[PDB]
């Protein structure tokens, strides 16, 4: 584990992370996809061998020795708010199990079911609070990656507010 487990946020491409493993915002079919998934596909295409996995689950595939944790959040266009909320919490619980299993000291994580799977709604708080619920009991350093300047501020505020 990390000597003093922390949460941090950075505004940049998760493909350039400085962590021991990465969480992909995957689709269920292990396709290259869009947004974070497409960036992950360019950087670690070898990790898409047999990466298909159901909604609400995570599946780790190594790129060399670098673990890519494919986490499938729900697409809120298809799920009800209630069922989507349940599957989004579940995906993050499965990420925490894999991060623990791998024994990493740090993980790079995007906010699942924001962007294309958000169903046109702002889900920063929903997604971040499910991330915290799952990762709080882990001792890895967690680095959250985002692209929007206002989201960076709001994620930073949410981290600092619980300190
Ligand atoms: C600005 C931003 N970053 N990620 C997102 O999902 C959005 C739109 C929210 O409605
Ligand atoms: Cl960048
Ligand atoms: Cl963002």
Curated annotation (Swiss-Prot):
Positions of the Macro domain: 4-163
Outcome of substituting residue 117 to A: Partial loss of mono-ADP-ribosylhydrolase activity; complete loss of ADP-ribose 1'' phosphate phosphatase activity
Membrane-protein topology: Peripheral membrane protein
Mod. after translation: Phosphorylated by host on serines and threonines.
Location of the protein in the cell: Host cytoplasmic vesicle membrane
Residues where ADP-D-ribose binds: 13, 27, 35, 115-117
Summary of subunit composition and partner proteins: Interacts with mRNA-capping enzyme nsP1. Interacts (via C-terminus) with host G3BP1; this interaction inhibits the formation of host stress granules on viral mRNAs and the nsp3-G3BP1 complexes bind viral RNAs and probably orchestrate the assembly of viral replication complexes. Interacts (via C-terminus) with host G3BP2; this interaction inhibits the formation of host stress granules on viral mRNAs and the nsp3-G3BP2 complexes bind viral RNAs and probably orchestrate the assembly of viral replication complexes. Interacts (via C-terminus) with host NAP1L1.
Function: Seems to be essential for minus-strand RNAs and subgenomic 26S mRNAs synthesis. Displays mono-ADP-ribosylhydrolase activity. ADP-ribosylation is a post-translational modification that controls various processes of the host cell and the virus probably needs to revert it for optimal viral replication. Binds proteins of G3BP family and sequesters them into the viral RNA replication complexes thereby inhibiting the formation of host stress granules on viral mRNAs.
Annotated domain remarks: In the N-terminus, the macro domain displays a mono-ADP-ribosylhydrolase activity. The central part called, the alphavirus unique domain (AUD) has a zinc-binding function. The C-terminus region, also called hypervariable domain (HVD), is mainly disordered and binds several host proteins. This intrinsically disordered domain contains 2 SH3 domain-binding sites and 2 FGDF motifs necessary and sufficient for the formation of nsP3/G3BP complexes.
The protein's name: Non-structural protein 3
Organism for this UniProt entry: Chikungunya virus (strain S27-African prototype) (CHIKV)
Taxonomic placement: Viruses, Riboviria, Orthornavirae, Kitrinoviricota, Alsuviricetes
Shown residues in whole-protein numbering: 1334 to 1493 of 2474
